[PDB]
């Protein structure tokens, strides 16, 4: 059943059919199988050598794009006091979230790109430090605490004048793949969080401005992008239709009016015999 597919399938010419006991256009949806009726069996076709490629839909390409996963603005001045901590998650920005949620399980390495911008409340070319604090490790409490010495944690130092910082985080789940969805509880007691697999816990990204404060204040914004690569995906799923409500669950409400309202996903038309964008000549 498995095979290498590089282009869309060709079409073979077909002739008239009038065979007893043969009804290719009839099917039984109840079996759970999709119709296997071929164009050649439904109508008379010509031969077509199809050269259309299928590489742009490879999962690696579909998910292989750097998408915004974190955006944080804070004030850089004499006092988030010149630094912040972000509990890593891929559920805050809807474009990336919806795409990842088209799958049940995903295994991939993640390229992380960090873009920094500044505005005066000229622009100083500041040095920032982004430290990866794994689960169970202590997070910094001040712009200058000892934690920043980063003896074991991985830290990256970059300047606002340099290109965005970049590094790859390996597939680090304690399982063979990340659980995009998790129908279970994170603990042995009954009060644990539902829908959050502990196994997919990355940790915290701690970012600070290394420079001591200047005589005036600035607004610094840090944007983090993630691009999955070396991807393997399993069990595709129904796409999200209702607007997202929380980063911690799949709770839903729906838009106030169609489209995508809980009562009607598709916008209404006058009747089942009404053609919306009918060509009038």
């Amino acid at each position: 059943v498995e095979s290498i597919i590089k282009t869309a399938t060709d079409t073979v010419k077909s002739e008239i059919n009038a065979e007893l006991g043969v009804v290719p256009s009839l099917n039984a949806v109840e079996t759970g199988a999709t119709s296997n009726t071929e164009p050649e069996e439904a109508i008379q076709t010509r031969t077509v050598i199809n050269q259309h490629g299928v590489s742009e839909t490879l999962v690696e390409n579909f998910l292989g794009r750097a998408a915004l996963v974190s955006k944080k603005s804070f004030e850089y001045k004499n006092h988030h006091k010149n630094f912040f901590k972000w509990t890593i998650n891929t559920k805050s920005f809807v474009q990336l979230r919806r795409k990842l949620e088209l799958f049940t399980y995903l295994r991939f390495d993640a390229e992380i790109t960090i873009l920094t911008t500044v505005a005066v409340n000229g622009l100083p070319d500041l040095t920032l430090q982004a430290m990866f604090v794994p689960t169970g490790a202590l997070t910094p409490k001040e712009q200058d605490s000892f934690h920043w010495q980063s003896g074991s944690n991985a830290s990256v130092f970059f300047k606002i004048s340099d290109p965005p910082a970049r590094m790859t985080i390996p597939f680090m789940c304690i399982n063979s793949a990340y659980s995009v969805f998790y129908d279970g509880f994170a603990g042995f007691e009954k009060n644990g969080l539902y829908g959050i697999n502990p196994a997919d816990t990355i940790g915290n990204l701690c970012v600070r401005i290394v420079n001591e404060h200047q005589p005036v204040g600035f607004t610094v914004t840090v944007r983090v992008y993630m691009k999955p690569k070396h991807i393997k995906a399993w069990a595709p799923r129904p796409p999200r239709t209702m607007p997202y409500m929380s980063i911690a669950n799949a709770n839903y409400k729906g838009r106030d009016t169609a489209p995508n309202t809980l009562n009607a996903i598709i916008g209404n038309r006058a009747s089942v015999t009404t053609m919306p964008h009918n060509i009038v000549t």
Binding site: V1, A28, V29, E30, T31, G32, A33, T104, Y105, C173, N175, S176, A177, Y178, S179, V180, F181, Y182, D183, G184, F185, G187, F188, K190, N191, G192, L193, Y194, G195, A199, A235, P236, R237, P238, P239, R240, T241, M242, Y244, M245, S246, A248, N249, A250, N251, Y252, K253, G254, L262, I265
Partner: protein, 238 residues
Amino acid sequence: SDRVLQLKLGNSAIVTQEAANYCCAYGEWPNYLPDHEAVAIDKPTQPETSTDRFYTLRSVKWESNSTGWWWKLPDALNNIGMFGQNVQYHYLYRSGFLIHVQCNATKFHQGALLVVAIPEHQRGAHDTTTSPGFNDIMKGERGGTFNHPYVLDDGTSIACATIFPHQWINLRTNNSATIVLPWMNVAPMDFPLRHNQWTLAVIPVVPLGTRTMSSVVPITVSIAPMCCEFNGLRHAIT
């Protein structure tokens, strides 16, 4: 030929004379954990016939205004028979499942049920930011009911639910649905009391209807664990 079927496991057997072939989730079949994928090092117990057999749950009634039903696995069976006992006495479990949904009526009745096995069906709550609680999820043998089947109670859609292993029970055509489920998880084994690999959903997309004598039309679910393995023996968390 593909309309009649007999399933036999352990001391249990089921026959149907109105089947529609049967589904093997993702084209797979259950199997025991091989040495090259194993993690837990203690010798597992493989009870075979005492656990790999059909367990029939309490039936539900298909009514004119029903929204649908669901049962999570292994939760629905965690307290039934020897499968339930092994689950309670062991920290780890692994198994596939043979699902058989039953529903008959008359040649004068109409109705269509979507019978789908959803992996990791993480439920969402309606119109609130508070996540579903333990009792909203763990219903046990009784199973639960859909609040908004149209979006599968998770903000997506039943329209696209066919992407999951499934069959239909269209009264005019068949009276049963059969789905074989292999172990589905990112780990070789799991703790059975806090995570459900699969969710069996039965939803009436086309409501039950007729103009002949009204009768209670039940829907019954029979599930047989397959290739059960248990590790991490201790006392029962009964």
